[PDB]
Design goal:
The structure is a homodimer of 367-residue chains. Chain A is built from 17 helices and four strands. Chain A is mainly α. In chain A, the strands form two sheets. Chain A has a two-stranded antiparallel sheet. In chain A, strands 3-4 form a two-stranded antiparallel sheet. The structure holds potassium ion (K) (4 copies). One potassium ion binds next to loops of chain A.
Chain lengths: 367, 367
């Protein structure tokens, strides 16, 4: 009999990769220069994004079914670890089969293969449960609504890291200048060939900063959480799903726009994505406050030395994204600039959030 | 003051992604049909593999410098977490700058940019240390040779998961049949279009199984480890570096070979890669046995109820890979088959290793 901690961490990493696989085709799409193509190149993008959102959800469901199974199987052995490897293998085929089923709706083979994948997942999990129940010492003591927060944090960590490094992976794979291109199109100066790739570096910088600071807010929240509810789990799943789309937003807001209207639309889309990624993070906190005596540590209750700080940490991005979006409709002429300032101001406000919250709590104390 | 566990886990995930970035260009290379191209298409591959091996090492060094810093900083805060995000950002640029420096050796800009990346890493770490020493309560109690095994396990887990799902990611991105191709080249049958992609699925199956079982051996070892030494860390780093090349081996041993000699050479290469990935795993155990009273739990000492099982679990792959390689030179005609049998036999031998070890310990007990 052995501890199951590391095996479940490995499973979480695999499940994060599998839930985020379908973001790569979305982010590998190109911006068409010919406007005649726009329509088509829009349609495809949408069809990809939808396939991502569904896929990330389906895998997440599997992840949940996993998390819950090994709350019934508290301890592992060699056979259980190997069968869990088998279950991970089966889960790894869900995205491909789902994409196949949606790409060929009329062909019956895709539905058949997706159903076979799901059935195989079920069979492997049944085998695990039967093995554990034939060796009762592998079952949890309570076996011999709640959701394990360790699994939640590991899954979220993996998703955040993938989304943060997505664009640097592409930069390393594709945008390393060729001596040939440097000798033909840039007159021999590698500085020029690298300057012609600056927009992609800007996109990666912005995306990494925003994703990492959203992870910072998530980490601050779950440091103060006692028990994670399935409601909080669904809210986190939605938040991560929308986090996945930040690299695309920053890749479009950094590429060239033929007309200013396009840049304004891009800013609006990016602000909407950030707001969606952050409002569900705030909703986790608000829902947890419904039953604070069980879900939160005493410090972050109504009347604690971390309640207001926590509220600020979770309400910063929603407010700033909403303000930028509003600027796109009220101060349009100064809107694109405001967004850029956000990218600098929001980090600083995190490095001084203690100070800013104290100042705001004193101002209203003298007003 | 807050616990630093999750922040370090997030850092480990990021560092694993960054250390494995350069395996993608190796695995995205194609097999040339024209033999005249072979030479060139060989050279490029080598130049890629080298760049991988160096890169994985450099990042690993950074990882080590990280692991060690936050053994001096036992507890974290908001500022420290944000500065750690900055340090991760800086580490994330090392592969690109190193590839740039090796691609343009004569241009001085690449050396300059790589040095700037390293210098920035150093500056951020100095800032972290100064912050911790100006707030002594953030320093470890011993501050107010050994290597943290938690970090080692997290890093290894991430690398293993990435290498295991590498090929399924490509299958999802590229090898989903197009209705167009199905209507033009496969006569409308999606079953045929999918059968024309079977080799890639076979490669993924084999690679995932082998990587996961190597992870199983690693997990079994480190369940029985007390303190991890830097010698063991270097051995693990070498093992993971060679693990990274398993997808390429399985992608070449499953593609078409013009002549049988090519298939034999491919089998030899794959066996060599597996042997390298596994012999350093066994070397970790052998080195730990040098000082068993400190590095290992009492069960796996010389004279325990897990010593022989552990030896078998770590010596299975080296022996089987060596045996297959030998078959390539003694039973050449039956060599390619033997390798395939290995892919089935080695998993089964893990599901029955208790039984097999008992039988072998009784046989020699009556001989
Ligand atoms: K973990
Ligand atoms: K990826
Ligand atoms: K971890
Ligand atoms: K990748």
């Amino acid at each position: 009999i052995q501890c199951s901690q590391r095996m479940l961490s490995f499973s979480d990493a695999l499940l994060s990769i599998i839930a985020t696989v379908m973001i790569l085709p979305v982010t590998h799409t190109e911006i068409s220069p010919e406007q005649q193509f726009d329509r088509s190149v829009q349609r495809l993008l949408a069809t990809r994004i939808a396939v991502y959102l569904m896929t990330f959800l389906i895998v997440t469901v599997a992840w949940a079914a996993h998390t819950r199974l090994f709350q019934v199987v508290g301890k592992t052995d060699d056979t259980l670890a190997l069968l869990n490897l088998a279950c991970m293998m089966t889960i790894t085929f869900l995205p491909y089969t789902f994409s196949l089923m949606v790409t060929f709706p009329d062909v019956p083979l895709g539905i058949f293969l997706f159903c076979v994948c799901v059935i195989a997942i079920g069979v492997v999990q049944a085998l695990i449960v039967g093995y554990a129940f034939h060796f009762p010492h592998l079952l949890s003591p309570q076996i011999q609504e709640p959701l394990s927060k360790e699994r939640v944090e590991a899954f979220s960590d993996g998703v955040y890291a993938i989304v943060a490094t997505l664009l640097i992976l592409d930069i390393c794979e594709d945008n390393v200048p060729d001596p040939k291109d440097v000798k033909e199109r840039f007159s021999g100066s590698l500085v020029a060939a690298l300057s012609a790739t600056g927009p992609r570096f800007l996109a990666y910088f912005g995306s990494f900063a925003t994703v990492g600071l959203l992870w910072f807010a998530h980490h601050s929240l779950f440091l103060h959480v006692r028990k994670a509810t399935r409601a909080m789990g669904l809210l986190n799943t939605l938040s991560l799903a929308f986090v996945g789309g930040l690299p695309l937003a920053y890749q479009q807001t950094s590429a060239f726009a033929r007309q200013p209207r396009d840049e304004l639309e891009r800013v609006r889309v990016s602000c909407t994505i950030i707001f969606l990624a952050s409002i569900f993070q705030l909703a986790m906190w608000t829902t947890a406050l419904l039953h604070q005596a069980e879900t939160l540590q005493p410090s972050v209750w109504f009347g604690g030395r971390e309640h207001v700080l926590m509220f600020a940490k979770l309400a910063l991005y929603p407010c700033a994204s909403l303000l930028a979006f509003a600027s796109t409709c009220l101060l349009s002429r100064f809107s694109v600039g405001i967004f850029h300032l956000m990218q600098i101001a929001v980090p600083c406000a995190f490095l001084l959030l203690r100070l800013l919250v104290g100042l705001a709590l004193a101002t209203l104390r003298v007003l």
